[PDB]
Coordinates of all heavy atoms in Angstrom, one line a residue:
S1 N 169.0 20.7 57.7 CA 168.2 20.3 56.6 C 166.9 21.1 56.6 O 166.0 20.9 55.8 CB 167.9 18.8 56.7 OG 167.0 18.5 57.8
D2 N 166.6 22.0 57.6 CA 165.4 22.8 57.6 C 165.4 23.8 56.5 O 166.5 24.2 56.0 CB 165.3 23.5 59.0 CG 164.4 22.7 60.0 OD1 163.9 21.7 59.6 OD2 164.4 23.1 61.2
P3 N 164.2 24.2 56.1 CA 164.2 25.3 55.1 C 164.8 26.6 55.7 O 164.7 26.9 56.9 CB 162.6 25.5 54.9 CG 162.0 24.2 55.2 CD 162.9 23.7 56.4
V4 N 165.4 27.4 54.8 CA 166.2 28.5 55.2 C 165.2 29.5 55.9 O 164.1 29.8 55.4 CB 167.0 29.1 54.1 CG1 168.1 28.2 53.7 CG2 166.0 29.3 52.9
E5 N 165.7 30.1 57.0 CA 164.9 31.1 57.7 C 164.9 32.4 56.9 O 165.7 32.7 56.1 CB 165.5 31.3 59.1 CG 164.4 31.8 60.1 CD 165.1 32.1 61.5 OE1 166.1 31.5 61.8 OE2 164.5 33.0 62.2
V6 N 163.9 33.3 57.3 CA 163.8 34.6 56.7 C 165.0 35.4 57.1 O 165.4 35.5 58.2 CB 162.5 35.3 57.2 CG1 162.4 36.7 56.7 CG2 161.3 34.5 56.8
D7 N 165.7 36.0 56.1 CA 166.9 36.7 56.3 C 166.7 38.0 57.0 O 165.9 38.8 56.5 CB 167.6 37.0 54.9 CG 169.1 36.9 55.0 OD1 169.6 37.2 56.1 OD2 169.7 36.5 54.0
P8 N 167.3 38.2 58.1 CA 167.1 39.5 58.8 C 167.6 40.7 58.0 O 167.0 41.8 58.1 CB 168.0 39.4 60.1 CG 168.1 37.9 60.3 CD 168.1 37.3 58.9
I9 N 168.6 40.5 57.1 CA 169.0 41.6 56.2 C 167.8 41.9 55.2 O 167.6 43.1 55.0 CB 170.2 41.2 55.4 CG1 171.5 41.2 56.3 CG2 170.5 42.1 54.3 CD1 172.7 40.8 55.7
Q10 N 167.1 40.9 54.8 CA 165.9 41.2 53.9 C 164.9 41.9 54.7 O 164.2 42.8 54.2 CB 165.4 39.9 53.4 CG 164.1 40.1 52.5 CD 163.3 38.8 52.4 OE1 163.6 37.8 53.1 NE2 162.3 38.8 51.5
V11 N 164.7 41.6 56.0 CA 163.6 42.2 56.8 C 164.0 43.7 56.9 O 163.2 44.6 56.7 CB 163.5 41.6 58.1 CG1 162.7 42.4 59.1 CG2 162.9 40.2 58.0
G12 N 165.3 44.0 57.3 CA 165.7 45.4 57.4 C 165.6 46.2 56.1 O 165.2 47.3 56.1
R13 N 166.0 45.5 55.0 CA 166.0 46.2 53.7 C 164.6 46.5 53.3 O 164.4 47.6 52.7 CB 166.7 45.3 52.7 CG 166.8 45.8 51.3 CD 167.1 44.8 50.3 NE 166.0 43.7 50.2 CZ 166.2 42.6 49.5 NH1 167.3 42.3 48.8 NH2 165.1 41.8 49.5
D14 N 163.6 45.6 53.5 CA 162.3 45.9 53.2 C 161.7 47.0 54.1 O 160.8 47.8 53.7 CB 161.4 44.6 53.2 CG 161.8 43.7 52.1 OD1 162.2 44.1 51.0 OD2 161.6 42.4 52.3
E15 N 162.1 47.0 55.4 CA 161.7 48.0 56.3 C 162.1 49.4 55.8 O 161.4 50.3 55.9 CB 162.2 47.7 57.7 CG 161.5 48.6 58.8 CD 162.3 49.9 59.0 OE1 163.5 49.9 58.8 OE2 161.7 50.9 59.4
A16 N 163.4 49.5 55.4 CA 163.9 50.8 54.9 C 163.2 51.2 53.7 O 163.0 52.4 53.4 CB 165.4 50.7 54.6
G17 N 162.7 50.3 52.9 CA 161.8 50.6 51.7 C 162.5 51.3 50.6 O 162.0 52.2 50.0
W18 N 163.8 50.9 50.3 CA 164.5 51.4 49.1 C 164.6 50.5 48.0 O 165.3 50.8 47.0 CB 165.9 51.9 49.6 CG 165.8 53.2 50.3 CD1 166.3 53.5 51.5 CD2 165.3 54.5 49.8 NE1 166.1 54.8 51.9 CE2 165.5 55.4 50.8 CE3 164.7 54.9 48.6 CZ2 165.1 56.7 50.7 CZ3 164.3 56.2 48.5 CH2 164.5 57.1 49.5
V19 N 163.9 49.3 48.0 CA 163.9 48.4 46.9 C 163.1 49.0 45.8 O 162.0 49.5 46.0 CB 163.4 47.0 47.3 CG1 164.4 46.3 48.2 CG2 162.1 47.2 48.1
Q20 N 163.6 49.0 44.6 CA 163.0 49.7 43.5 C 161.7 49.0 43.0 O 161.8 47.8 42.7 CB 164.0 49.8 42.3 CG 163.4 50.5 41.1 CD 163.3 52.0 41.3 OE1 163.4 52.5 42.4 NE2 163.0 52.7 40.2
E21 N 160.6 49.7 42.9 CA 159.4 49.2 42.3 C 159.1 49.9 41.0 O 159.2 51.1 40.9 CB 158.2 49.4 43.4 CG 158.4 48.5 44.6 CD 157.2 48.7 45.5 OE1 156.3 49.5 45.3 OE2 157.2 47.9 46.5
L22 N 158.6 49.1 40.0 CA 158.4 49.7 38.7 C 157.1 49.2 38.2 O 156.5 48.2 38.6 CB 159.5 49.2 37.8 CG 160.9 49.5 38.2 CD1 161.9 48.6 37.5 CD2 161.3 51.0 38.0
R23 N 156.5 49.9 37.2 CA 155.3 49.5 36.5 C 155.5 48.4 35.6 O 156.6 48.3 34.9 CB 154.7 50.7 35.8 CG 154.6 52.0 36.6 CD 154.0 53.1 35.8 NE 154.8 53.5 34.7 CZ 154.5 54.4 33.8 NH1 153.4 55.2 34.0 NH2 155.3 54.6 32.8
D24 N 154.6 47.5 35.5 CA 154.7 46.3 34.7 C 154.7 46.7 33.2 O 153.9 47.6 32.8 CB 153.6 45.3 35.0 CG 153.9 43.9 34.4 OD1 155.0 43.7 33.9 OD2 153.0 43.1 34.5
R25 N 155.5 46.1 32.4 CA 155.6 46.4 31.0 C 154.3 46.0 30.3 O 153.7 46.8 29.6 CB 156.8 45.7 30.3 CG 158.1 46.3 30.8 CD 159.2 45.5 30.2 NE 159.3 45.6 28.7 CZ 160.1 44.9 27.9 NH1 160.9 44.0 28.4 NH2 160.0 45.1 26.6
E26 N 153.8 44.8 30.5 CA 152.6 44.3 29.8 C 151.4 44.5 30.7 O 150.9 43.7 31.4 CB 152.8 42.8 29.5 CG 153.6 42.5 28.3 CD 155.0 43.1 28.3 OE1 155.7 42.9 29.3 OE2 155.4 43.8 27.4
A27 N 150.9 45.7 30.6 CA 149.7 46.1 31.3 C 149.0 47.3 30.6 O 149.6 48.4 30.6 CB 150.0 46.5 32.7
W28 N 147.9 47.1 30.0 CA 147.1 48.1 29.3 C 145.8 48.3 30.0 O 145.0 47.4 30.2 CB 146.9 47.8 27.8 CG 146.7 49.0 27.0 CD1 145.6 49.4 26.4 CD2 147.7 50.0 26.7 NE1 145.8 50.6 25.7 CE2 147.1 50.9 25.9 CE3 149.0 50.1 27.1 CZ2 147.8 52.1 25.5 CZ3 149.7 51.2 26.7 CH2 149.1 52.2 25.9
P29 N 145.5 49.6 30.4 CA 146.3 50.8 30.3 C 147.5 50.8 31.2 O 147.6 50.0 32.1 CB 145.2 51.9 30.6 CG 143.9 51.2 30.8 CD 144.2 49.8 31.1
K30 N 148.4 51.8 31.0 CA 149.6 51.8 31.9 C 149.2 52.0 33.3 O 148.3 52.7 33.7 CB 150.5 53.0 31.4 CG 149.9 54.4 31.6 CD 150.8 55.4 31.0 CE 150.2 56.8 31.2 NZ 150.3 57.2 32.7
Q31 N 149.9 51.2 34.2 CA 149.7 51.2 35.6 C 150.0 52.5 36.2 O 150.7 53.4 35.7 CB 150.4 50.1 36.3 CG 150.0 48.7 35.8 CD 150.8 47.6 36.5 OE1 151.7 47.9 37.3 NE2 150.5 46.4 36.1
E32 N 149.5 52.8 37.4 CA 149.8 54.0 38.2 C 151.2 53.8 38.8 O 151.7 52.7 39.0 CB 148.8 54.3 39.2 CG 147.6 55.1 38.7 CD 146.7 55.6 39.8 OE1 147.1 55.5 41.0 OE2 145.6 56.0 39.4
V33 N 151.8 54.9 39.2 CA 153.2 54.9 39.7 C 153.1 54.3 41.1 O 152.2 54.7 42.0 CB 153.7 56.4 39.8 CG1 154.9 56.4 40.8 CG2 154.1 56.8 38.4
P34 N 153.9 53.3 41.4 CA 153.9 52.7 42.8 C 154.3 53.8 43.8 O 155.0 54.7 43.6 CB 154.9 51.6 42.7 CG 155.1 51.3 41.2 CD 154.9 52.7 40.6
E35 N 153.8 53.5 45.1 CA 154.1 54.5 46.1 C 155.5 54.6 46.5 O 156.0 55.7 46.8 CB 153.3 54.1 47.4 CG 151.8 54.4 47.3 CD 151.0 53.7 46.3 OE1 151.5 52.6 45.8 OE2 149.9 54.1 46.0
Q36 N 156.3 53.5 46.4 CA 157.7 53.5 46.7 C 158.5 54.5 45.7 O 159.4 55.2 46.2 CB 158.3 52.1 46.7 CG 159.7 52.1 47.2 CD 160.8 52.4 46.2 OE1 160.7 52.0 45.1 NE2 161.8 53.1 46.6
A37 N 158.1 54.5 44.5 CA 158.8 55.3 43.5 C 158.6 56.8 43.7 O 159.3 57.6 43.1 CB 158.4 54.9 42.1
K38 N 157.7 57.2 44.5 CA 157.4 58.6 44.8 C 157.9 59.0 46.2 O 157.5 60.0 46.7 CB 155.9 58.9 44.7 CG 155.5 59.0 43.2 CD 154.0 59.1 43.1 CE 153.3 57.9 43.8 NZ 152.1 58.3 44.5
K39 N 158.8 58.2 46.8 CA 159.2 58.5 48.2 C 160.1 59.7 48.2 O 161.2 59.7 47.5 CB 159.9 57.3 48.8 CG 159.0 56.4 49.7 CD 159.6 55.1 50.0 CE 161.0 55.3 50.7 NZ 160.9 56.0 52.0

C-alpha cells in the first residue's frame, strides 16, 4: 500500500538524457532551444 518507488528505469533513462525536450507552443517571444535538443 506504500506509494510507488522511483522507477530505476526512469532514473537510467533520465541519466542517458535522450528524452525529447521541446519549446513551449504558448510562449511569446519564442523560447530558446533546450540544451537536450542540441546534444
Side-chain angles (χ1 to χ4, degrees):
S1 72
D2 266 351
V4 288
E5 203 184 335
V6 176
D7 215 329
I9 288 179
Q10 180 198 9
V11 169
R13 181 195 64 189
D14 292 331
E15 191 272 331
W18 282 123
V19 288
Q20 178 77 348
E21 292 183 354
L22 307 160
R23 308 182 300 181
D24 197 4
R25 291 176 65 190
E26 279 57 53
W28 206 245
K30 64 185 182 70
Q31 298 181 356
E32 274 188 16
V33 163
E35 281 67 16
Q36 191 274 321
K38 284 172 301 142
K39 262 169 56 65

